[PDB]
Amino acid sequence: DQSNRYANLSLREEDLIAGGKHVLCAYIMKPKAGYGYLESAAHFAAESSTGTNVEVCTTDDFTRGVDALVYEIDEANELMKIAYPVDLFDRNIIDGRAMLASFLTLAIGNNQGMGDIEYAKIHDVYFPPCYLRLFDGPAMNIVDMWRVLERPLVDGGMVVGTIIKPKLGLRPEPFAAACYQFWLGGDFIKNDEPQGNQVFAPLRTIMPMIADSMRRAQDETGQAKLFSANITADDPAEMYARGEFILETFGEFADHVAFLVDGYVAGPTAVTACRRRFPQQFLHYHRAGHGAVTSPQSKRGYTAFVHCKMSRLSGASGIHTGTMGYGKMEGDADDKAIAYMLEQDDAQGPYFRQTWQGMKATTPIISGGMNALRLPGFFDNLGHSNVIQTSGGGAFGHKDGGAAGAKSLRQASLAWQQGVDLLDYAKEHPELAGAFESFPKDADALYPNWRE
Amino acid sequence: MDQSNRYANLSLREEDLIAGGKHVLCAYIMKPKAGYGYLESAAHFAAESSTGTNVEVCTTDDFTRGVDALVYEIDEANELMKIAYPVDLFDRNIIDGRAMLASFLTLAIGNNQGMGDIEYAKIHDVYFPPCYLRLFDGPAMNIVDMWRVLERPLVDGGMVVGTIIKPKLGLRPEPFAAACYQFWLGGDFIKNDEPQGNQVFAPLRTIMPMIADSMRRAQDETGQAKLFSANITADDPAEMYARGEFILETFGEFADHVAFLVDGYVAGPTAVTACRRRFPQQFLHYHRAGHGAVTSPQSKRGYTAFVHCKMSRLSGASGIHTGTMGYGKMEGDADDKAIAYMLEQDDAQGPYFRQTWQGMKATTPIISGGMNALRLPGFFDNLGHSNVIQTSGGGAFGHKDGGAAGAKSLRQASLAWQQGVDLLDYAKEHPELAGAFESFPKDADALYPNWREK
Amino acid sequence: NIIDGRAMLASFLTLAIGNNQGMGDIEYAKIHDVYFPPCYLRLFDGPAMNIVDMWRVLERPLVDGGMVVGTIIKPKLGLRPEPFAAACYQFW
Ligand SMILES: O=C(O)[C@@](O)(COP(=O)(O)O)[C@H](O)[C@H](O)COP(=O)(O)O
Ligand SMILES: O=C(O)[C@@](O)(COP(=O)(O)O)[C@H](O)[C@H](O)COP(=O)(O)O
Ligand SMILES: [Mg+2]
Ligand SMILES: [Mg+2]
Asked: Do B269 and A234 touch (CB under 8 A)?
C-alpha cells in the first residue's frame, strides 16, 4: 500500500490547473479482484512516475517532490485522476523541446501491464501552458490548401477529396488515369494508407505520372489540384528520400503536395520526422490501427479524442477524426468535440477545458464510407463544412465514374452550405442525381422518395 | 455488400499456402457485430486489409483481384479467422528495396481495427515466408555480444545479472551515479528506467560522464566488465542520433559496453529502426512500455504479446522484454515461454504457425517485472535455460543491505539454479543470498516456507 | 527552387534592381514600392515566429502584449566574457 505517498485527495483540481505545473490525466480504471481502489490508483501513479512495487534504499525527499499524485477518485464510476509534475517529462538535448514519447511512456506505458489492474484508459488530459509551449505544434492547416485553391482563408469551405481505390493493385498507368479523372471535378487526392512502393507500382515510376495528371487536370479545369503522398517507412532515411523525390518530381507544384504518415503504426517518431524535416509541407496524419485502443469496445490505452488531441502537439496539419457515426467505422455524433478541440483556441473535453495559447489548429479529415448522400447529415451535426473530406467508394463507386463522383461530392457540399435539401438540389445537377442511383440503399434510408 | 465470393476461398489448404512461400498468413480471433454474418464480415475484413472497400469501384481490374487478401479458414463457433496476404501487397524501400514493418501493420492490423461491422479482431499468430522474412533487417547483436565482453562462454554463457536504477524518476546525477557504482560491484548490467533521459533535474550531458566514471571505477575494483543500457528514445530522430553520439563519445574506450534502449511501442517501429540502422554495432534494447494496451489478454483487439515480440525480431531488436511468464508483477502466463523460444531459435512453434528463420540472428529475452533472487529459480524451471538478460529494480535496491548486496543475491540465486542447488541450501553459505529472504519475507514465505528455521 | 519549387528573393532583386542600376543612360533609379500578387507571394517562406512567441514565453497577452523591454550589450565590442555576462545579468 503506497496510498499515503502517491494519493492526495485533498488537492483541488482548480488549484492544480491554476498552478500550471501539472499535466492532469483522467482515467477510467478498475482494479483486479482483491485489490482496493485507492491502493490500486496509488500504485498506478507510482509505476507511472517514480515508484515500483516495493520500497528501495535510493529514494530521497527530492524524488518524492516529483511524484505523480492521485487527487480524485470515484470508485462507483471507475474514475481516477492523476497529476503529473511537469518536471517528470523528457526534454531534447539538441533544442530543449518536449517530446510526446515521454508523455506516453509515463501516462500510458508500463501501467498498461500491471497485474493488479484490470484495465485503465485515458479519456482526457490537460496540458499546462509551460508544457504545451514546448511542443512543435502544427505548422500548416487547411488554410494553406485554401490559399493554393484561392478560396477564403477563413471559412473557405469543404476541400473535395477522395482516396484512390483499389486500396492496392492499381498499376502506375491506371492509377494516374484515375487521378486525372477525379481532379476533373475534385480538389484533393490522397494515397490510400498502404500505397507506396509496391513492386507492381514503384514510387519512382508512379509519381511522375501522378504529377502529369495534376498538371493536365489543372490546365483543363483552370483550378489548382492537391495531392497527399504516403511516405511512411521504418527508416527515417527512407521517409526523407521519398519526400525529397516527390518534391523534385512535382517541381513548381510541390506546394500542392501533402505528406501522409501512418502515425499510429509507425509512431510519433515517424510523425515528428516528417514534421521537422518537411515543415513547409502539409502533414497528413493517417491513424490506421488506432481502433486497437480507441474503440469503445476497449477499456485500455486512450480514446480517439485523446489520440487526436496529442496529434496537434506532434504537429499534424490534419488528422482523421472519423465520420462521428455517419460512416462505416466506429464513431459517435458526440465526436464533434474532437473537431472543436483540434481547430479552436479554446474548447471543452470530457473532463478538462483546454486553451492553446495560439498554437495553430489541426484540420479534421473526414473519411470512411462517406458519399454525397451522407454529407448533409454529417455536417448538420458538426455545424460547419470547413474540413477536408475524402470519399473513396463515394467517388469511384459512382456509376458515371470518378469525375462525376467528384462533382457529386462537391454539389453535396454547396447544397448544405446554402440550406437546400439534397433531393431538391439533385433535380438540377445530374452528377448528384447519379449518386442517388449509385448508392440506392443509402438513398432509400436518407431520402426515401428519391425515385419519384 | 457480401464480398465472400471474391475475398474468401475456403478451399485453399494452409499447407499449400505455406509451401508456395508467397503469402503472409495471419490468424485472428474475430467476432462480427450483431446482425452480420461471420464469413461476409471476414471477407469485408480481408478487403479493408488489402485491396477493397465497402462498395464496388469502377477502377477494379483483374490484376487488382490477383493480389486480394483471401480468407482461407474460418471457425465461427470459435471466432477464428485466417487470412492470406500476397507478399506483393507490402511496401518496400526506394533506397534499398528492403521490407518495412510499418506496412505489414498498416494492412494486417490497421483500418480493420475500426470497422463498424466488427466487434473485435486480434492477431494471435503470423507466418512470414522466406522471401518476405529475408527482406527485414533482423537483429545485428545478441546476448552473445554481451557474453563476449564479459569474457563468458559464447554458448550457454548464462544469465546477465542486471537491474534498473530506481527510483524510476527523481534521482539527481550524483546519487544516480553512486547507485550505479554500488550495483556494478556485484552485478553486470544496468539499464535506465524506461522514461529516464534528460529531465531538468538530471540532464543527460551531466549524468552520462558520471555513469561512465562509475563504470570505470567498478571495472577497476572488480576486474570485470560492466554494461549499461542508455535510453535514447525521442520524437525527433535527430535527437536520437544526438543522444547516441554523445553517449558513445562520453564512454570512449568502453562505448561497446553501452546498449541503446528504445521505448519501441510508444515511439513506434520508426524509432526502433532509426536506432537499429544508425547504431547497428550497439546492442538494441527494445522496451515495450505501453504494449499492454493491446497485448493484455483482457483486450480482444490488436495483437498478442507473442506477435509483438516476434515482430521485434524483424525490426532487429537485440533483446526485448518477454515478461515474467506469470512469475512477476506484470501480466503473464507460464505458457509465454513460447515467446522466448520463438525469439531465440531458428525453428520454433507458434500458436498456429511453425516458423523457420533461415539463420536470422536471434533476439534475447529480457526478464523483468517485480523479480528478485527468490523468484528466479521457479521462473527458469519453466523456461528450461538461463541464457537471458535479467533486470530486477526492487529486487536489487530493495535488498535490506543495499544494491551491491542485491546484485550478489541475484547472481548467487542464478548460479544456484544453474548447478541444481536448492536456493535455501545455497543461502546457507552465501550471506548476500540469505539477506534476500529477509528483504522480501512475503515471497520467502510462499516460495520457501521453512526459510526461517534453516 | 529545383528542390521544392519555392520562390527566391534573390531572383527578384536580380531583375527588379540588378543590372538596371549600372545602365549608362540612366542617372538613377530607386524602388519606392512593390506589389506581390498572391500566386507569387504564396511561394515565399514567410515568418515562422513573431513577438507573439515572445509574449507567450513571457506569459503575457498574445494580443496587445505590450513592449518587450530590451537592450543591446554595450560597448559594441571589447567586453570580455566575464563583464559581458555580468552586464547581461544586471539588465535582466
Ligand atoms: O480505407 C478506408 O477505409 C478509408 O479510405 C475509407 O474508405 P472509403 O471512403 O473509400 O469508403 C479511410 O481511410 C478510413 O475511413 C480511415 O479511417 P478513419 O477515417 O476512421 O481514420
Ligand atoms: O518500470 C518497471 O516496472 C521495470 O523497470 C521493472 O522494475 P522492477 O524490477 O523494480 O519491478 C520494468 O520496466 C518492467 O519490468 C517492464 O515490464 P515488462 O518487462 O513486462 O515489459
Ligand atoms: Mg484508406
Ligand atoms: Mg522500467
From this structure: yes
Round the CA-based radius of gyration of chain C to a whole number and report it: 22
Nearest to A17 by CA among A124, A129, A100, A98: A129
The answer to whether A153 and A190 are in contact (CB under 8 A) is no
Asked if B183 and B190 count as a contact pair (C-beta separation under 8 A), the reply is yes
- Closest residue by Cα to residue B230 from B281, B176, B175, B285: B285
A43, A81, A286, A398: which is the annotated catalytic residue? Answer: A286
Residues 6 or more apart whose Cβ sits within 8 Å of residue A20? A128, A129, A130
Tell me if B157 sits within 8 A of B144, measured CB to CB: yes
Q: Which of B23, B122, B166, B430 is catalytic?
A: B166
DSSP states along B214-269 = HHHHHHHHHSS--EEEEE---SSHHHHHHHHHHHHHHHGGGGGGEEEEEEHHHH-H
CA distance A283 to B52: 25
Q: Going by DSSP bridges, is the β-strand pair B284-287/B258-263 parallel, antiparallel, or unpaired? A: parallel
Across-strand partners of A84?
Answer: A23
Question: Do B262 and B275 form a contact (C-beta atoms < 8 A)?
Answer: yes
| Rounded Cα–Cα distance for residues B302 and B109 (Å) | 7
A22-31: strand order across its sheet: A69-74, A79-85, A22-31, A117-126, A301-302
Q: What is the resolution of this structure in A?
A: 2.0
Q: Can you say how many angstroms the Cα of residue A163 is from the centroid of all Cα atoms in its chain?
A: 16
Neighbours of chain A (3+ CB pairs under 8 A): B, C
Alpha helices by DSSP H, listed for B326-450, are 337-344, 376-383, 393-397, 403-418, 423-427, 431-439, 441-447
Beta-bridge partners for A83 = A24, A69
| Chain A neighbors of C48, CB-CB under 8 A | 139, 279
Report the relative pairing of strands A159-163 and A346-348 from DSSP bridges.
unpaired
| C-alpha to C-alpha distance for A331 and A334, rounded to whole angstroms | 8
Cell of A201: 507500382
What distance in Å separates the CA atoms of residue B163 and residue B183, rounded to the nearest whole number? 8
Contact indicator for C84, A154 with CB cutoff of 8 Å: no
Please report how many Cα atoms fall inside a 13 Å half-sphere around the Cα of residue A92, on the Cβ side.
21
Contact present, B394 and B380 (Cβ < 8 Å): no
Cα C15 from Cα C18, distance rounded (Å):
5
- Alpha carbons B176 and B197: distance in angstroms, whole number: 12
CA atoms within 13 A on the CB side of B199: 27
Structure-block grid coordinates of residue B158: 548464462
Q: Is B166 a catalytic residue?
A: yes
Number of Cβ atoms within 10 Å of the Cβ of C11? 10
Task: For residue B196, give the chain A residue with the closest CA.
Answer: A90
| Determination technique for this entry | X-ray
The DSSP H or E segment spanning A181 is helix A172-183
